[PDB]
């Protein structure tokens, strides 16, 4: 693909970017988090919210958007675009109006250009090898952010000087084991040696060191040791300050949970979503909406990610609130058994239960 | 079977990079972790949800897919695949438009080439060394983080550089011992020896010490020190480093339960599954849903994790909690003694019991 | 038995291996930590678990599995086994279909051959000096952690690298005590002596400090003191970091209950627990269950772990357990009788006891 | 009686291993706590359990299994067995079909010997110096740790490398007393001196330091200080390094009890309990009923220890403990009585009393 280049000389792509270890930490982190929530397809109820079954885009969006791919495969690859190269592409495959399955176009097989008349056109090319002209009115389009408003940013291109350096210092330390600037002890003699003299002075040191002797220096010989620090040699603190540069780069805090390096667990969630994965879930149902679904439908449906497993209590905390909730009236117990993965009862436990001495406000005298 | 190359010279493969005991622990804690949940099978029903007992994949998932492997090898097997390499394949022995087993196909005896229709051609090694061929329509294909669409990412190709770094450390840790860089008294004589003489100075100093008597240094010989240090021998902190590094190439926050290295114990269970196992049960499962079941079947079956094992708690939560449910007529007795293993009790111990002061809320008045 | 080298240039196998310190400490406790609890045959029963009795294998799980071994021996060999050579084999003895009993079968004694068809051959060697050929249908295997799918991992082999520094390191500490180099101060005299003055200057040193004098360095004797540190010389830090690194190598954690060096005890053993124990005892399972049971009683039989002596409590937390659990009506007062060794009383103690005041959430008006 | 080597150079065996303090403190610590447990034997009844106050092995165990040792004396002898040698034997003296006692056969007086049957040929030595045989069924051969399947482990041969350089420690410790390696104060002389005048010399200065005068150092004379360290001459970090490297060997996690150097005090019982001592009382229970009960009595005689003596608590906890389990209806008052040591009192207090707001369960309506 593309490729950049820094101060530090060393050329940066996806695949040397990827050769990191916070890039690939926090993006495979942040894609996989907001990747695994299931997508929903609601319709408007004046008596709430109904699930939206036997409209196609429900399954589309759950279980598989397509015969091949997975819907977790899916969102992860789509986010992974947007993180990386900037724009993600999908082709709407639809027929007589209805929608049958979306298909995601990888910027590897994919032509784009510009036309006269300021549009674009799209080509894309199939695993067999003919290259199809896709229509512009069946490709959703979804940026991310941008500076300009039409095209997203490229974290590669913007941030080749922040991943040229990390690259040059892991390649500094890992050449640190070749280079020689790890040697500790160097010995002397004061007199011109021809090379099988080196060669047999460095065999009769390590003979001496493995039948247990202890060496002796005669003559003119001698030996120093030299002041090094492998610490400073492999350059751990600067490598350390790249990990925080790459996770504050990618609007990760460091100290989210803790991947890189507020007293209960359940807190910790909470602030991981509140504030990483907001913006993308809302940019996600946004685009979606705005695309997918035709003003015929738009007012009627729209699309909600639920935050619950990512919210999982304590036990205590769990028990209590249920409790608390069913004995105020507000949820009947069937919720509860159900929200357990337990089977329903019927009778009463369907209907709202409250306190003996509850008095309508207007009754009272 | 990979044979990839490094700045610091090792090579880097499965078997070397196993060789590291940071590898084998968060390999390990991954794969025995997913494996040891069992995975049901579900039907839908109105009245809740229900097991499939009579369906035959029940069983195959549960107990064994074949007949001499168990779940658990099933399983971690399968993990391990797709950890390491990054695709994992299954073969679906099935008759009579049922499934009957499935067995893992591992890529050691494998051939897959490309064909002019992108189909895939796979023929498998049985194991008395004959080949047969596999349609594409009976092996189930399943990836771990693709960054192409189609082929999951190898984790020892993308993180060769951060893997040679640690070999070369452990490597020369292990040398020092050899190269004779802990030597420390260093003997010198003013003259020229022969070696014969060295040797007879080196027993000397033995019997010397044997004796437990002081050296007296007679002449022209003297004794010096050199200032080594054995943990900058060693590599102590770069091994450290490189500890915490590979923990964070697998996405593995390091030292949450210690085996790098919230205050609650639950709180960090949870911590540890919600952050890292749920992206791993998520693309199981659905894949597994796509792939094994039939698109009439898919409407009314489908497979979720039971996951308890790992919410153990105190034994003042679990009576707290169960005393809290029973009490609020959420829970029957009867499914509170099933989960503690005890036998069960009809009559009134299988119906939801209230306090007395309760009233539905359309009676009051 | 097999042994590897590795690049310190010890020579690791079982006996060395065990010859160490953390291997023998991690092998130990997990092994008896896991053989220590009780395994059990239960009945799947319509009204809940019976405990199977009639039964064969209860016994021969239970007491003994043979006329000379115990169940304990018996699981600890086979856990050890697994753990360090990587397989473990027992050999069924059977009559008229059912099973008499079981016997372990070392890995010394036993002969692994492959055949044309690729299956096994195995040749037991007893200990009068026969060897017996034993039917591949008469063997259980058990694998263990395996990359391939057929054959289990060995730890000698994959560790030889992490085993063989902490050999070396041990034996140069050993060996610091002979080579001379904790010596500290040195004489020295400017002239040359025949080595019957050495002895004679050694021991009128030991004598004149044997009687309480003072030295007194007539002439050209001298004295200087050499500026070393035994720590350094026996290398504490590595062999300390040898240890952290053998107990990351077994999966045990270093601070799992600080057995190498969560604030209550009971919450320790339920990390230790679910943490290190649940893969073994699921695997164990599993595979007992796949082999030692024939079709006809797979679905009517299983066994399972109990986890009691473990998980003992505070004596205020089990009372307070007991007490909320018998007051809700959970369990009688005949089953925490039995808990605490008491003998059952008849009547009333029995039958599930509720608060006066609780209605039946259909009976509420 | 093993007479084992080590890198150090120093002989280890059972008497150089017991001079050292450490292995006295573990082995006492392990031996003492299993003995002062009694064993209890068991009779299985329908109504609960019931002591087996007739049978003879019941007051062989607990009071004496001889008529000169006592039952402490018998099990401390025997888990030291375990410990150092890895078996202990004990032979039945049985008559009339039943045991009428049991003595303890030392290592020190036995010969043990291989046949062509793989049976064991045993051989005592009596007080008086008379061999006499012992038939193989006669003997209860117990064993500790086994790597084989047959005979245990002897600490001290795999331990010898441990030993050793505790052993080379603490010998140079104490010799450096001897060596002069603790002298400081050296004076000097610019002359040729003779016997007589080193000895005034040095009694002059001890005169002057009686007769409190300062030195004056008259000449050619000169004082000088070496730079000395006492603790680095006596190797304290290294002994203590091999405390706790001694106690992690004979699998006691260290300084649990402050023996080698959770909050409450009944919290580290527990965990002393429940981490250390469960395997030896799994082990030697199993054992004794496998070997010492008939076939027929097995089923309906067990073995338990009594583990209440290192369970003692506070006395507002065990008020507490009580009061719940009695106002409960669990206890009844006499078995709280009896647990503090009083007389009984008939009537009432042997019955289960509750509160008075209880019902039964089926009651209520």
Redesign the interface.
Known sequence: GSRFTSDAGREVS??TA??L??V??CV??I???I??MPLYLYKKTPDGRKEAVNHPLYDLLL??PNSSQ????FF??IL?AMLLHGNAYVRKLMSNGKIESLQ?M?S?RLTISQDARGAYKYAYR???GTQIDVPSAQVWKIRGYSLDGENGISAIQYGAQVFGTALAA??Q???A??NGN?Q??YYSVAAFLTPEQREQFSAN??Q???S????????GID?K?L?????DA?L?QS?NYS?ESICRFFAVPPSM?????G????A??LAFLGLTLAPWLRRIEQSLSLDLLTPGERRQYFVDYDVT??L?A???A???F??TM??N?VMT?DE???AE?????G???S??????A???LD?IT
């Open positions: 996806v695949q990827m050769s270890d916070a690939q930490a495979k982190l894609s996989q988090s990747a695994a279980s598989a997975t819907a977790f495969e992860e690859c992974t995601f990888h590897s199939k695993l067999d892991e390649r330390a890992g050449r084991f070749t790890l500790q002890i040191v390590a001496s060191v493995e247990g002797r202890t060496p002796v220096l005669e003559g030996v040791a002041g090094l620090n492998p610490a492999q751990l490598r990990v949970i803790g991947h890189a390096s007293s209960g667990i359940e910790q969630q497993t990512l999982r304590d036990s205590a769990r028990s209590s249920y409790a069913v004995n009236g117990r509860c058994r159900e993965g337990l089977p329903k009862l009778g009463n436990a209907v709202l239960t409250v306190q003996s509850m008095v309508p009754e």
